[PDB]
């Protein structure tokens, strides 16, 4: 308990920085909750750091490739490939924006088609699952309400029954 | 686990044991008490005739 | 207190905190509220989450630039493949053939020039592959008049190809649009990216709703058995203490 | 299981569905009948003594 | 305050319940159609899963 | 502290309706289970909703059928293109042997 306590205090000091640690009730339960939270935060912070560093690397690599392709196209097709008509540019932007929206690896149909299908399938699947859960919540709520009514009716009937028994006991 | 613990604390007597006790008691009343009362009813009718 | 719990449960969805915990421990609840801003919705530190969002934005910008070029590159490759297939089927016009040969040669020279130019640093001393310089490849380009002609024709062909690709994207997402005229299809294409983003946003909202409903269901499943047990306890009392004992004695007397 | 236990105990204690029954209905009916017959016997006795 | 909460709470609760129940009575008559639609929905979901 | 005449009448009606009046404790328990959020009265999936669902699923079915057909076209087209690309590989392979 003494080790978990040390970890929590160190973790709280790290989170609150230069601000005095607020006084809180130190009991077995508050310590367990704080401990789970500290473990969770530490594990997530580690994961997020690794993801952030990787994204920086990927940003550099994508930039390098973009330059490469731009240079390749300029040398091969001339500067004129960048002088598309207003509508041409609009079409290009829409393809680009659609691909970014679906987080695709490339602009090929082999990537676009499965992505659109997955998006549509996931949306329907989740909507059905939400309907089913809503029915279950309503059903359980009804069961719970009936049970609560029953509980109150039983309390009343039991009190009446106890009074009646006492009255009869006096008669006996 | 909380619900199971609550069931064990509240289980003296076991619901099945209690239903059995209730059913036995019901049978005892029909076999012994109800006929006794019928006999007494009949006896009262005879006493009326004696009157 | 109920508000504090809702707030903490929404932000710290992992914490199993009951109302009894916050009632017995008021100062602890204050600590959790203060911790909530410091902890992101996912349990990570707020600073690190901010850094992550910034780094994601940067990546998206770079990716947008790369994709622009990538779309053109792929279209050109697809165009070349289509023209090649038509050339083998004997259906290509002499002008198309010249265009195809000229464009293929321009791209190839460019690709190979780059293979040679390891953008490396002039080292005045670096041995080229096969001893070839960029100039050796430029000599294999078609005549300058044909290169300019190919580049002018490519612009019109590229716009047509971009249009065809957009229509295909649209036709797959909204197959009902195939029965519509080119003008209406072009209007719908201009909204396609936004429609797809909306659908993605809808999915995210429905997932959040799902998580909320799930949390409520779990609460109800926790309360319901206890209520049943209280009812059972009352009935047991009526059966054991009143019917088998109190009333049975009364009936006997 | 809890729901089944509750339903079984309740059915037993509430045979006519609306009222908690502590006495066996068959027995309750006999007590009433016996009380009525004793009241008649007491009248006849009083009448004869009078 | 206590009495007001009780009164409002019960009203609220049963209102919510009744609202839930009243919706149901109309529903019994529509049950055969509901079964048919549910059967149709299951059949369509199965077809959609195959596609 | 004020209960309008309407709510009082409604509550009296509730008392008269023979429905058990839930005590404060019971109300607290049940109301907890109540998300403020307007969870729209589960409009009990009005036959209409099921009908709407059947319509929605039929629309989805039609959509999947159209998309499957399109995919089959794209697949046939790609298969043909892949065979022809193999022929190109063979032609380019001959040209490469000429250069050697």
Swiss-Prot record, chain F:
Q: Which domain of life is it from?
A: Eukaryota
Give the subcellular location: Cytoplasm, Cytoskeleton, Microtubule organizing center, Centrosome; Cytoplasm, Cytoskeleton, Spindle
Coiled coil ranges: 41-73
Q: How does it assemble?
A: Component of the HAUS augmin-like complex. The complex interacts with the gamma-tubulin ring complex and this interaction is required for spindle assembly.
Q: What does this protein do?
A: Contributes to mitotic spindle assembly, maintenance of centrosome integrity and completion of cytokinesis as part of the HAUS augmin-like complex.
Tell me its family: Belongs to the HAUS3 family.
Q: What is this protein called?
A: HAUS augmin-like complex subunit 3
**Originating species:** Xenopus laevis (African clawed frog)
């Amino acid at each position: 308990m003494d080790e978990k306590s040390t970890k929590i205090i160190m973790w709280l000091k790290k989170m609150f920085g230069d601000k005095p640690l607020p006084p809180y009730e130190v009991n077995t339960r508050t310590m367990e909750i704080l401990y789970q939270l500290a473990e969770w935060n530490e594990a997530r912070d580690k994961d997020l750091s690794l993801v952030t560093e990787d994204l920086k690397l990927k940003s550099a690599e994508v930039k390098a490739e973009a330059k490469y392709l731009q240079d390749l196209l300029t040398e091969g097709l001339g500067p004129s490939y960048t002088n598309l008509s207003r509508m041409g540019n609009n079409y290009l932007n829409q393809i680009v924006d659609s691909c970014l929206a679906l987080e695709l690896k490339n602009s090929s149909l082999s990537s676009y088609i499965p992505a659109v299908n997955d998006l549509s399938s996931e949306l329907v699947a989740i909507e059905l699952n939400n309907q089913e859960m809503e029915a279950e919540l309503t059903s359980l709520r009804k069961k719970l309400t009936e049970a609560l009514v029953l509980e109150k009716s039983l309390e009343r009937d039991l009190k009446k029954a106890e009074e009646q028994c006492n009255f009869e006991k006096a008669k006996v | 686990s909380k619900t199971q613990r609550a069931l064990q604390k509240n289980t003296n007597p076991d619901t099945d044991a209690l239903l059995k006790s209730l059913s036995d008691h019901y049978s005892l009343e029909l076999d012994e008490m109800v006929p006794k009362m019928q006999r007494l009813i009949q006896q009262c009718e005879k006493h009326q005739e004696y009157g | 207190m109920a508000q504090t719990l809702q707030y903490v449960s929404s932000r710290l969805s992992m914490l199993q905190i009951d109302e009894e915990d916050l009632e017995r421990n008021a100062q602890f609840g204050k600590v959790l509220i203060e911790l909530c801003p410091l902890l992101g919705p996912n349990g990570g530190s707020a600073n690190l989450n901010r850094e992550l969002e910034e780094t994601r934005r940067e990546l998206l910008l770079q990716r947008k630039m790369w994709m622009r070029s990538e779309v053109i590159y792929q279209l050109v490759q697809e165009m070349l493949l289509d023209l090649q297939v038509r050339k083998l089927e004997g259906s290509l016009t002499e002008e198309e053939r010249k265009f195809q040969d000229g464009l293929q040669q321009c791209m190839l020279v460019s690709e190979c020039s780059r293979l040679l130019t390891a953008d490396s640093v002039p080292p005045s001393d670096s041995t080229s592959i096969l001893g070839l310089d960029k100039q050796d490849l430029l000599d294999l380009l078609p005549p300058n008049m044909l290169v300019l002609w190919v580049r002018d024709r490519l612009q019109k062909q590229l716009e047509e190809a971009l249009k065809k690709k957009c229509f295909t994207f649209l036709s797959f997402h909204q197959p009902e649009t195939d029965e519509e005229g080119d003008v209406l299809r072009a209007a719908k294409v201009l909204r396609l990216a936004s429609t797809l983003e909306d659908e993605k946003r809808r999915l995210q909202n429905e997932q959040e709703k799902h998580q909320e409903m799930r949390a409520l269901l779990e609460k109800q499943q926790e309360i319901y058995p206890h209520v049943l047990l209280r009812c059972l306890s009352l009935l047991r009392q009526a059966a054991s203490e009143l019917r088998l004992r109190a009333q049975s004695d009364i009936d006997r007397i | 299981k809890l729901d089944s236990h509750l339903k079984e105990l309740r059915d037993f204690m509430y045979p006519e569905g609306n009222t908690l029954m502590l006495t066996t209905p068959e027995l309750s009916g006999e007590f009433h009948q016996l009380g009525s017959q004793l009241e008649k016997l007491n009248h006849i006795t009083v009448e004869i003594l009078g | 305050h206590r009495t007001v909460r009780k009164i409002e709470g019960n009203l609220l609760w049963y209102q919510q319940l009744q609202h839930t129940e009243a919706q149901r009575t109309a529903e019994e008559e529509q049950q055969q159609r509901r079964k048919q639609l549910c059967k149709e929905i299951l059949e369509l979901r199965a077809e959609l899963h195959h596609l | 502290n004020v209960v309008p005449d309407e709510k009082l009448q409604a509550f009296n009606t509730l008392k008269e309706s023979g429905k058990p009046v839930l005590d404060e404790k019971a109300l607290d328990e049940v109301l907890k289970t109540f998300s403020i959020s307007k969870v729209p009265a589960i409009e009990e999936v009005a036959i209409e909703k099921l009908e709407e669902e059947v319509k929605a699923l039929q629309k989805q079915k039609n959509l999947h059928i159209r998309r499957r057909n399109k995919l089959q076209m794209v697949e046939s087209g790609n298969r043909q293109m892949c065979l022809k690309s193999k022929d190109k590989e063979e032609e380019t392979g001959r040209a490469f042997q000429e250069v050697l």
